[PDB]
Design a protein around this ligand. Structure first.
Ligand SMILES: [Zn+2]
Lengths: 97, 179
């Protein structure tokens, strides 16, 4: 929660007004904020960044691979490359435009 | 025409590269193909997509159906067009001259016919002597290895038929199905 972030960042003294404005509005103007209830979550990537086993998307032969984008990649422990080599080893195919 | 899309599955495999092939995969479904949709879906560049489309347009691969919004459909009957002309050019490079073993003088690297060194043929040595220098002649040597090229092309150009047999056969059987 915003209070938990404040807490962990030791920025809790942002002022209740700002704290409130951040909570009610900043995390509301948020594009498609995936928020089950109390706690905010990740919106862009539907799939958990688990660096492995996208055989579902490979066998999803209904959209020619579903526009596998790199924007949601290379930010993990292995810069896509480590996964790709195994990804190269496996069916996964990598290219760039 | 499901097996017409099979000759297509085999030419994309056989010829055009990933960037082309990914676009060509979309061309698989000949129901509706707009420019905005294909751009957004392929996640490609617009200038570059226009280049590929322009390239495919050059193939007459697609019949641009205007609304303006577009639609794209197969035109190539040039599978034979690549075939008749390529076979001609390879048979030209294949069909060699003759033994064409002209004498050649290793010192001056001059070239002679069997006829050239025959006038030179020196009866006192029972062999062929070069013209301006009496050094003995040799084989045409390297010159044109058109005979080695003939053998290579034959193995190489006719060796790609087996891997094309799936499609050479599907096309033939599909064309028969089309009537
Ligand atoms: Zn000579």
């Amino acid at each position: 929660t915003l209070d938990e972030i404040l807490d962990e960042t030791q920025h809790l003294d942002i002022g209740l007004k700002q704290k409130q404005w951040l909570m009610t509005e900043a995390l509301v103007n948020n594009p498609k904020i995936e928020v089950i209830d109390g706690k905010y979550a990740f919106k862009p990537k539907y799939n958990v960044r688990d660096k492995k086993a996208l055989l579902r998307l490979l066998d999803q032969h209904d959209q020619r691979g579903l526009g596998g984008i790199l924007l949601e990649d290379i930010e993990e422990a292995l810069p896509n490359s480590q996964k790709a080599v195994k990804a190269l080893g496996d069916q996964i195919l990598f290219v760039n435009r | 025409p499901a097996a017409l899309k099979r000759l297509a599955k085999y030419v994309i495999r056989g010829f055009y590269g990933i960037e082309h092939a990914l676009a060509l995969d979309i061309l698989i479904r000949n129901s509706c193909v707009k420019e905005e949709d294909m751009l957004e879906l392929l996640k490609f560049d617009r200038k570059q997509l226009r280049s590929v489309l322009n390239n495919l347009k050059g193939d007459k691969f697609i019949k641009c159906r205007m609304r303006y919004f577009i639609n794209y459909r197969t035109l190539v009957n040039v599978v034979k067009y690549k075939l008749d002309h390529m076979r001609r050019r390879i048979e030209t490079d294949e069909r060699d001259s003759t033994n064409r073993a002209s004498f050649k003088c290793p010192v001056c690297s001059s070239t002679f016919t069997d006829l050239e060194a025959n006038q030179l043929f020196d009866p006192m040595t029972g062999t062929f002597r070069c013209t301006f220098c009496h050094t003995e002649v040799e084989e045409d040597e390297s010159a044109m290895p058109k005979k080695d090229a003939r053998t290579l092309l034959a193995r190489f150009n006719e060796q790609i038929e087996p891997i094309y047999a799936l499609l050479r056969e599907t096309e033939d059987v599909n064309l028969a199905y089309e009537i």
